[PDB]
């Protein structure tokens, strides 16, 4: 790999559900590259299907110099308009930070995210109560578990 | 607009296909250090009568800005044709505006007329009804930016 991610920090954590995500990313670029890097943040709403994935934002970054590079990827919050009930945002969800080069993903960093609403204790509620509770999104906070990334790397062709 | 001054603007790829991304090579000088990024934007202006048909093509954040001469290439996506009442709206003269802002305050705008023609059609020999109804193959539409006659507007802003 020409590109190795050295560090990912979530700048604003915990945060309101609706606050934009800010990921400060440091990486090394080991050789010259013709094209931009394409970074993406994906909200993963359900553990069982991809049906509730949302691509939050996609950022093209370049041209890329040799050596250390550091930037902030600020991404939109998730859209709540399409959910069967708002309580689907609560409890553990997932966020995936990925980078691709010339449309081929080469790294993915996944995080679990805790989500809680002021005034509610989800551990004390049965499933029907969670489904039906009135959610005030302005009282919902996320907490990204950012010290435990799942990191996956895929070999790609680069400029070869 | 004292801290940043645009020195040169070149269109790299001209004429080009309507669907080809725009490439603007821009040289400027930065006379003093700046806290924040410059925000560049390209705007497609589809109607000369109203702003309903404006499309922001892309917005590029660049920084940090070193003192002195800076040069970069602003690549922007082409216009979207999905929302037009008819495809021939892309033909004839339209406008593109290159602009830069600092901390959400626009300080310069560089505007260009753009000629647009389709292979096989002579618009000067067509009446208005013909132009409205002709089948446009976007793949055969070329734009030609009139890059020697920029309209340049400068707006005093506060900087830091």
């Amino acid at each position: 790999s020409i590109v190795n991610i050295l560090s990912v920090n979530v700048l604003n954590n915990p945060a309101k559900f609706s606050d934009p995500y800010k990921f400060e990313i440091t990486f090394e670029c080991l050789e010259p590259l013709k094209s931009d890097l394409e970074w993406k943040l994906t909200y993963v709403g359900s553990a069982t299907s991809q049906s509730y994935d949302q691509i939050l934002d996609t950022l093209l970054v370049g041209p890329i110099p040799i050596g250390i590079n550091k930037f902030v990827f600020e991404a939109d919050p998730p859209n709540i308009d399409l959910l069967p009930q708002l309580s689907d945002v609560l409890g553990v969800t997932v966020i995936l930070l990925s980078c691709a080069y010339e449309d081929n993903e080469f790294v993915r960093v996944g995080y679990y995210v805790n989500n809680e609403m002021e005034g509610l204790n989800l551990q004390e509620m049965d499933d029907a109560e969670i489904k039906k509770v009135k959610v005030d999104i302005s009282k919902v906070w996320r907490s990204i578990l950012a010290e435990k990334p799942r990191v996956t790397r895929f070999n790609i062709q680069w400029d070869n | 607009m004292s801290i940043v001054n645009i020195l040169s603007v070149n269109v790299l790829n001209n004429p080009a296909k309507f669907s080809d991304p725009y490439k603007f090579e821009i040289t400027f000088e930065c006379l003093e250090p700046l806290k924040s990024d410059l925000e560049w934007k390209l705007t497609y202006v589809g109607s000369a009568t109203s702003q309903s048909y404006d499309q922001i093509l892309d917005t590029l954040l660049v920084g940090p800005i070193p003192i002195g001469i800076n040069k970069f290439v602003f690549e922007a996506d082409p216009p979207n044709i999905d929302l037009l009442p008819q495809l021939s709206d892309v033909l004839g003269v339209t406008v593109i505006l290159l602009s830069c802002a600092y901390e959400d305050n626009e300080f310069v705008r560089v505007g260009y007329y753009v000629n647009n023609e389709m292979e096989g059609l002579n618009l000067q020999e067509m009446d208005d009804a013909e132009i409205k109804k002709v089948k446009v193959d976007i793949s055969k539409v070329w734009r030609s930016i009139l890059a020697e006659k920029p309209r340049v507007t400068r707006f005093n802003i506060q900087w830091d």
Binding site: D36, D57, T58, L59, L60, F71 | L60, L61, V62, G63
Partner: peptide, 6 residues
């Protein structure tokens, strides 16, 4: 470093 959102 130049950053463009899609």
């Amino acid at each position: 470093l130049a950053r463009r959102l899609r």
